[PDB]
Amino acid sequence: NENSDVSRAEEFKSQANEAFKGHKYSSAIDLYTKAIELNSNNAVYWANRAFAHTKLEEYGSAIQDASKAIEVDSRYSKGYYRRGAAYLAMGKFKDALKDFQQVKRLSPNDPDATRKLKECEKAVMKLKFEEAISVPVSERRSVAESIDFHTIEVEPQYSGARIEGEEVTLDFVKTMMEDFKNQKTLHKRYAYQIVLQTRQILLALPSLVDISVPHGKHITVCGDVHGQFYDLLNIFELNGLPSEENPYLFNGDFVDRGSFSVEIILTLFAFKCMCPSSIYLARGNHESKSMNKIYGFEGEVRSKLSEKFVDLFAEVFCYLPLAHVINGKVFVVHGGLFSVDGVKLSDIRAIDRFCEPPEEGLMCELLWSDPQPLPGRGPSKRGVGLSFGGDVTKRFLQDNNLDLLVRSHEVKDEGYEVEHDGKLITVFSAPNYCDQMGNKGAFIRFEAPDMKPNIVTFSAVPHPDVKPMAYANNFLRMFN
Ligand SMILES: [Cl-]
Ligand SMILES: [Mn+2]
Ligand SMILES: [Mn+2]
């Protein structure tokens, strides 16, 4: 059957490349799929759809597409290049080393092939040391055990904000945010005060927090912000600062990727210190030593804070709750649902969350999952977690007497998308993601008692000339 039309397939490829130039990666993937359907022996099509997949952080789909590209042409170096870029993007340095070994073997005198190979060799042995000294955080002394914040002297020439006494006050938070806005810094004493007080608050919280919004009051659910501090300031300017009267739920992924991650996490933690009922912080996948070590937050901390804040921030992130339930009706996780059925809220509440997210179990799945339009389950596009359909959402909701599922974790054009017949809503509060996506951000206000989700969208604001991934892993920087 010679029924493949190369002309129509090349028409789809150019259309997909045009959508690629315009950062319309989902449309590009669709057009590459149509191109592949009409011609599956062109490895360039597979490599391009893989490239578009990595742009959407769909690294599993990327690896699979690049693998089919390699299957088509053994000597197509761009297939191995794309697969290794996807592996490198998700931290699998050894697999990246394999694919970049192959990339050099094909083009043997190309300077960049040997360069990326020597780069990956340095990275894998560096990772060998890092992995050899890896110890579970629950078997380690807390940083709080060896640092009392009252002991830290503040030199009189420090011009930034000061916490007088034990209490974090709204006046200090406003001064801290204005200093952060002008690219100033907070003293180590007050950073330690904030983070150590936050450690106290979070460790006494269950893994699933029941949030009670009484009759007539409201709450704002926010999605990923990934270190875009100036868009966080925009959210607060458009919707009001966190307060007992105007509470916030931030659905994980506060840091990494964006280059103002320290300022966000210090602002969010301080608001929690000031009035705990004024803000609720769920955990994301990027509140993890695995992610922060390579995606910017850890390097941002080492630059603006010190090296002990790295372990302290990791420990505090391990204490973050995994989920929230608003008025016993609205279920808010970051990632999604699970590979098994019959999971009740009691199961989530009882999770021993004080560890780095494993590669298996309820914790990993609720932090990494994505919804799919078709019913059922399927392999994760990210290679971590799973894809769950509308039947999974509906069963979980009726099983738990819940009305709605709210989640984030995935970028959206308008900052939101309603799926699963109005039972799942993705919310994403990082507009113009990575300074290149061009999307709007969004947040959802919930007013009691009827709990109708009032979605509000917003656009990005300017910020100082600090490029994304600035403090991130060097090798991950020189791609995209
Ligand atoms: Cl993410
Ligand atoms: Mn996420
Ligand atoms: Mn995210």
Numbering used by the authors: 5 to 484
Passage from the reporting paper:
One of the phosphatases responsible for plant phytochrome dephosphorylation and thereby increased activity is the phytochrome-associated protein phosphatase 5 (PAPP5). Studies by Ryu et al. have shown that the PP2A domain of PAPP5 dephosphorylates the NTE of AsPhyA and AtPhyB, whereas the TPR region binds to the C-terminal histidine kinase-related domain of AsPhyA.
We crystallized AtPAPP5 in a monoclinic crystal form that resulted in a dataset at 3.0 Å resolution. Three TPR repeats (TPR1: V10-L42, TPR2: W50-V76 and TPR3: S81-L110) are linked via a long helical linker (P115-T173) to the PP2A domain (L174-N484). In contrast to mammalian PP5 structures in our AtPAPP5 structure the linker region is completely defined by electron density. Here, Mn2+ ion 1 is tetra-valently coordinated by amino acids D257, N289, H338 and H413, whereas Mn2+ ion 2 interacts with amino acids D228, H230 and D257. The αJ-helix of the C-terminal inhibitory motif is indirectly involved in shielding the active site by stabilizing the closed-state interactions of the PP2A domain with the TPR region.
